[PDB]
Design an enzyme around this catalytic site. Sequence first.
Site, PDB file in Angstrom:
ATOM      1  N   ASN A  20     -59.146  95.220  78.746  1.00  0.00           N
ATOM      2  CA  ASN A  20     -58.986  94.931  77.301  1.00  0.00           C
ATOM      3  C   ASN A  20     -59.823  95.957  76.519  1.00  0.00           C
ATOM      4  O   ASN A  20     -60.832  96.442  77.067  1.00  0.00           O
ATOM      5  CB  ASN A  20     -59.347  93.473  77.042  1.00  0.00           C
ATOM      6  CG  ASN A  20     -58.443  92.542  77.813  1.00  0.00           C
ATOM      7  OD1 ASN A  20     -58.888  91.517  78.352  1.00  0.00           O
ATOM      8  ND2 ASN A  20     -57.175  92.904  77.853  1.00  0.00           N
ATOM      9  N   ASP A  79     -61.952  95.414  74.311  1.00  0.00           N
ATOM     10  CA  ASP A  79     -63.325  94.838  74.171  1.00  0.00           C
ATOM     11  C   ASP A  79     -64.152  95.014  75.454  1.00  0.00           C
ATOM     12  O   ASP A  79     -65.311  94.508  75.484  1.00  0.00           O
ATOM     13  CB  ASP A  79     -63.256  93.360  73.777  1.00  0.00           C
ATOM     14  CG  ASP A  79     -62.975  92.435  74.940  1.00  0.00           C
ATOM     15  OD1 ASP A  79     -62.171  92.808  75.767  1.00  0.00           O
ATOM     16  OD2 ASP A  79     -63.612  91.367  75.026  1.00  0.00           O
ATOM     17  N   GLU A 130     -46.898  88.546  82.083  1.00  0.00           N
ATOM     18  CA  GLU A 130     -48.356  88.819  82.210  1.00  0.00           C
ATOM     19  C   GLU A 130     -48.565  89.799  83.367  1.00  0.00           C
ATOM     20  O   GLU A 130     -49.321  90.692  83.253  1.00  0.00           O
ATOM     21  CB  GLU A 130     -49.119  87.516  82.427  1.00  0.00           C
ATOM     22  CG  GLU A 130     -49.281  86.681  81.166  1.00  0.00           C
ATOM     23  CD  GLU A 130     -50.123  87.286  80.055  1.00  0.00           C
ATOM     24  OE1 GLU A 130     -50.748  88.342  80.296  1.00  0.00           O
ATOM     25  OE2 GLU A 130     -50.151  86.691  78.961  1.00  0.00           O
ATOM     26  N   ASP A 153     -57.864  73.706  77.032  1.00  0.00           N
ATOM     27  CA  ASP A 153     -58.995  74.203  76.198  1.00  0.00           C
ATOM     28  C   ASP A 153     -58.739  73.951  74.717  1.00  0.00           C
ATOM     29  O   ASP A 153     -59.690  74.116  73.945  1.00  0.00           O
ATOM     30  CB  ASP A 153     -59.214  75.710  76.368  1.00  0.00           C
ATOM     31  CG  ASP A 153     -60.506  76.243  75.776  1.00  0.00           C
ATOM     32  OD1 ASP A 153     -61.548  75.532  75.872  1.00  0.00           O
ATOM     33  OD2 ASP A 153     -60.467  77.375  75.234  1.00  0.00           O
ATOM     34  N   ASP A 205     -58.335  91.390  82.474  1.00  0.00           N
ATOM     35  CA  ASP A 205     -57.417  90.258  82.776  1.00  0.00           C
ATOM     36  C   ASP A 205     -56.999  90.362  84.243  1.00  0.00           C
ATOM     37  O   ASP A 205     -56.797  91.472  84.661  1.00  0.00           O
ATOM     38  CB  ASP A 205     -56.199  90.275  81.856  1.00  0.00           C
ATOM     39  CG  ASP A 205     -56.505  90.101  80.371  1.00  0.00           C
ATOM     40  OD1 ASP A 205     -57.619  89.661  80.022  1.00  0.00           O
ATOM     41  OD2 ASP A 205     -55.603  90.369  79.588  1.00  0.00           O
ATOM     42  N   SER A 262     -63.562  93.482  78.416  1.00  0.00           N
ATOM     43  CA  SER A 262     -63.176  92.399  79.343  1.00  0.00           C
ATOM     44  C   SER A 262     -61.975  92.887  80.193  1.00  0.00           C
ATOM     45  O   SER A 262     -61.278  93.860  79.785  1.00  0.00           O
ATOM     46  CB  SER A 262     -62.833  91.111  78.632  1.00  0.00           C
ATOM     47  OG  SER A 262     -61.756  91.372  77.735  1.00  0.00           O
ATOM     48  N   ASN A 293     -58.806  86.106  81.689  1.00  0.00           N
ATOM     49  CA  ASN A 293     -59.651  87.097  80.995  1.00  0.00           C
ATOM     50  C   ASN A 293     -61.094  86.849  81.438  1.00  0.00           C
ATOM     51  O   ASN A 293     -61.531  85.712  81.346  1.00  0.00           O
ATOM     52  CB  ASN A 293     -59.388  87.004  79.497  1.00  0.00           C
ATOM     53  CG  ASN A 293     -60.234  87.941  78.668  1.00  0.00           C
ATOM     54  OD1 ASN A 293     -61.448  87.817  78.685  1.00  0.00           O
ATOM     55  ND2 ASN A 293     -59.619  88.815  77.894  1.00  0.00           N
TER      56      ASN A 293
END
Length: 129
Positions: A46, A48, A35, A101, A52, A50, A59
């Site tokens: 990202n 979109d 990562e 989650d 990280d 967003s 995120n």
Amino acid sequence: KVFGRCELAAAMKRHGLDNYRGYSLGNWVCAAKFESNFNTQATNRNTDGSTDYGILQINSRWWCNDGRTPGSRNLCNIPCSALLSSDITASVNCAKKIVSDGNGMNAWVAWRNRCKGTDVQAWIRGCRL
Ligand SMILES: [Cl-]
Ligand SMILES: [N]
Ligand SMILES: [N]
Ligand SMILES: [Pt+2]
Ligand SMILES: [Pt+2]
Ligand SMILES: [Pt+2]
């Protein structure tokens, strides 16, 4: 901070990730490796819009506030900048919520594609731990 491999395994065990929701410590270190390359300061944008953040690339779409992610949640109730600290507490605390989650560690795409079903114990071999 760019953590050493054994350095990070030690910190993660301290902050209570080893066997957390049944994921051995090798899983968490392999994920941090792919990562962020063990860099607490890593950010990636990202498609979109967003971003990280940090050692585990949490995120901004769900988990932290960076103030430029339209219609996002702040489910760890923190600023994304807290995830970039040389202290990994904030990143560990939010990881615990993410991995609880429902999807487990599959929420980390690099874990799913590069660590899942591997000899992850090898990520902790040679470490005083
Ligand atoms: Cl935002
Ligand atoms: N901790
Ligand atoms: N620490
Ligand atoms: Pt390494
Ligand atoms: Pt620590
Ligand atoms: Pt802790």
